[PDB]
Design a protein around this ligand. Sequence first.
Ligand SMILES: [Ca+2]
Length: 108
Amino acid sequence: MVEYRAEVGQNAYLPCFYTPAAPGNLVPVCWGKGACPVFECGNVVLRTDERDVNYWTSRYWLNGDFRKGDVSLTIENVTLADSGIYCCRIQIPGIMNDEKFNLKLVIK
Ligand SMILES: [Ca+2]
């Protein structure tokens, strides 16, 4: 687990990257609130798949290019309620092999 900081009223940046084969040949990724569970993400805030961003909402979005493996999460206009641990999960095809990144956001 690695810790990151943001300020109230600004945007949070939570880095998360992998190296894909090609822009149209990606690995599905999920983000969730809470430490990464055994499988999948809990409390999902964003999802991508082999070609598209399939799930996002007004305050949870990507500022970088997911087709290049930049799956870093932006949380827009944060409040103290956004403090906590987030999971970035790189859902490599196969069993028991995802990359599970735990990110703690501290907000002041
Ligand atoms: Ca897997």
